[PDB]
Ligand binder design. Sequence first.
Ligand SMILES: C[C@H](CS)C(=O)N[C@@H](B(O)O)c1ccc(F)cc1
Length: 263
Amino acid sequence: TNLVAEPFAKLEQDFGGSIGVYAMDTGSGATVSYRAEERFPLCSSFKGFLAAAVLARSQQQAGLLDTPIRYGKNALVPWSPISEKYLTTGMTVAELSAAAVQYSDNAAANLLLKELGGPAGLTAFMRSIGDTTFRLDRWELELNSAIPGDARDTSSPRAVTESLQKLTLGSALAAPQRQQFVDWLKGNTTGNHRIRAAVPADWAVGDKTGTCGVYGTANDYAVVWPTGRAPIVLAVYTRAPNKDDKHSEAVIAAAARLALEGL
Ligand SMILES: C[C@H](CS)C(=O)N[C@@H](B(O)O)c1ccc(F)cc1
């Protein structure tokens, strides 16, 4: 819990919806929590964990990452800029994972989900590193419905942070695989106005965003490297109760700030 929750409550009330935060200092063990136990839509942030499910297989399947995929045009659901660009060449499993992570590429996420046996398969992976909260049920783009109280395609900020720590900094992935996942996260292009905007620009960050396009539901999670110190892992999710509600990158940044300053 949190005995100085007031800063977050005010931010949430001003926003009009739900804020969800869970931050961990790996070095000290300190944590900041606000609706950290409550379910929020993953939207696109599942793609980070997806690439990690991929990097995990690649430890048993050699050359999985270099495997080209010659996808067709009807793989190209909206918001697939990298896939769209590379339609004519195809793309490797690695490049798909990269584009999944750093551009939120929709088609590339679906192509990887297929290689792993769909949402249930990604969900199996996360159960296998100790996440009993995460569940992916659907593909892009239906998984973005963000319907109030729908448990499909949801996790909790703390289980997202705890899983992210396992895959980037602990033992769930082999050291190189682990380095590749952190490197993919560090090259993200979509998170500049969210958690990154709350960090001092001297700290290395890798993050993955999600944006459902409805119900003011948007999110981001991150590993952040302070000067001289163990890294911080955090997740900041949002939703709102009207379909019409606009999400807010500012609130995600602000809530991340409050977590970082809490720590
Ligand atoms: C409707 C929404 C676009 S607003 C969508 O279909 N997918 C989300 B995703 O978060 O799952 C998304 C958002 C931004 C991107 F650049 C890529 C993907």
